Nucleic acid binder design. Structure first.
Ligand SMILES: Nc1ccn([C@H]2C[C@H](O)[C@@H](COP(=O)(O)NP(=O)(O)OP(=O)(O)O)O2)c(=O)n1
Ligand SMILES: [Mg+2]
Ligand SMILES: [Mg+2]
Length: 427
DNA sequence: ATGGTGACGCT
DNA sequence: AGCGTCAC
């Protein structure tokens, strides 16, 4: 029976990423409790990234900076750039490109977010194992690697524990067998050490990584020993790891589906799923989800690392909460123009860098009283990278929504505007 | 009043 | 197409 051990997959995730971008730029922020904040005026601004020094004080994301300062009076802050009246993330996108380009030298990557990429190292491992004629794997090749589940069986400090586990792992390895999945993961980890060394050397940024046989285990592994460490999760480690792993920790189960798995089956931990037949899981959660859960709780997943380094959409949005909701046509048109101007600049850059053009413009709004992320979503043709045309067109496709008799007024007021370019073609 | 991103499934 | 879920 298939054991889901055919691939070597890593997930690299940058440590407190936006903070590291700002600390590289401003040495005064290095090795300090510090956070990145967006929009100073309302409660000191919203925190969106937090250094590990600040995390020790209890500072978190989705905290107002005024409140964070109560937990950490010496907290240092770096502000997100604002342009055309809104937060602008260009600096972090550019830093992301630095890291993605380095990772791409080692293998084809799947960009999973601004600061994460999956890597399929199956081929690189095969070639490295051949150049490694015999040759045991030294612990010195794995200086920041944790082996999840080890040490076990018959030191009081972290690094001591890490080494004992690594020693047990390496001592047990079957280096004479090049088809051994554990051996393949170990070689994968050596390559990821090299990848992470290159990222830090060439950018100054530290990161963590997971190495396993699929994306979900690699992602889970990555978080086990953050920051600045990497973790190998073998197929064998899965039963003990999952036996006390809350279901919500597994990627895609952190929301309503995960909550329904818990409620419907009356379980708490990922490993408890093994008790159910594939048909039983499909009966509760659908064919796709059921099959996925049945395999995943056994450490098996087939979701491929997709060869994609570039985002498939480029979007610009702004919210206008509470009393600031947009109530005039002048207002709506001004802000659509602001969004369209940012989008134009990003699109033009994208076309020069990446030899493609977007062909569809998606416009989304939220009206006051409405409670969803988006109220109304409409698309139209994107034929010209011109901000005035795009903003004019967006207005055209959303002017239907103005239920107001007076058309110089806007009702109900708008609490969100969103412009997104999609459907890219080669150019 | 976290805000501003982005991928992908469903019908 | 437009809506919803899930994630950083
Ligand atoms: N809700 C969120 C989550 C992340 N981000 C941004 C800021 C983060 O630095 C960056 C990466 O997100 P992240 O990986 O979830 N956390 P971060 O890299 O800051 O810390 P780690 O826990 O990964 O060390 O995306 C955001 O702007 N809004
Ligand atoms: Mg990160
Ligand atoms: Mg991340």
């Amino acid at each position: 029976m298939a054991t889901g051990q055919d691939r070597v997959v890593a997930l690299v995730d940058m440590d407190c990423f936006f903070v590291q971008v700002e600390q590289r730029q401003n040495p005064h922020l290095r090795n300090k409790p510090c956070a990145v904040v967006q929009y100073k005026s309302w409660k000191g601004g919203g925190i969106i990234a937090v250094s590990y020094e600040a995390r020790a004080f209890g500072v978190t994301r989705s905290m107002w900076a005024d409140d964070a300062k109560k937990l950490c009076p010496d907290l240092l802050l770096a502000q997100v750039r604002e342009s055309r009246g809104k937060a602008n993330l260009t600096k972090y996108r550019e830093a992301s490109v630095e890291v993605m380009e380095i990772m791409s030298r080692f293998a084809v990557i799947e960009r999973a977010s601004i600061d994460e990429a999956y890597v399929d190292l199956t081929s690189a491992v095969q070639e490295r194992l051949q150049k490694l004629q015999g040759q045991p794997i030294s612990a010195d090749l794995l200086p920041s690697t944790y082996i999840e589940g080890l040490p076990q069986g018959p030191t009081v400090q972290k690094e001591g524990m890490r080494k004992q586990g690594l020693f047990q792992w390496l001592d047990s390895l079957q280096i004479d067998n090049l088809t051994s999945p554990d051996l393949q993961l170990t070689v994968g980890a050596v390559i990821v050490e090299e990848m992470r060394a290159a990222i830090e050397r060439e950018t100054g940024f530290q990161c963590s990584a997971g190495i396993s046989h699929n994306k979900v285990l690699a992602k889970l592994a990555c978080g086990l020993n953050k920051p600045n460490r990497q973790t190998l999760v073998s197929h064998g480690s899965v039963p003990q790891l999952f036996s006390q792993m809350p279901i919500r920790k597994i990627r895609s189960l952190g929301g309503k589906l995960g909550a329904s798995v818990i409620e419907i089956l009356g379980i708490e931990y990922m490993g408890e799923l093994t008790q159910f037949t594939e048909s039983q899981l499909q009966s509760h959660f659908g064919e796709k989800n059921g099959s996925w859960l049945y395999a995943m709780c056994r450490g098996i997943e087939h979701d491929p690392v997709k060869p994609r380094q570039l985002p498939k959409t480029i979007g610009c949005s702004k919210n206008f909460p509470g009393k600031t909701a947009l109530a005039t046509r002048e207002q709506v048109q001004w802000w659509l123009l602001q969004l369209a101007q940012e989008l134009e600049e990003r699109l033009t850059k994208d076309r020069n860098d990446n030899d493609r053009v977007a062909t569809q413009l998606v416009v989304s709004i939220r009206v006051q009283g409405d409670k969803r992320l988006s109220s109304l979503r409409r698309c139209c043709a994107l034929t010209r990278y011109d901000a005035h045309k795009m903003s004019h067109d967006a207005f055209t496709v959303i002017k239907n929504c103005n239920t107001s008799g007076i058309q110089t007024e806007w009702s109900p007021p708008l609490t969100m505007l969103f412009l997104c370019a999609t459907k890219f073609s080669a150019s």
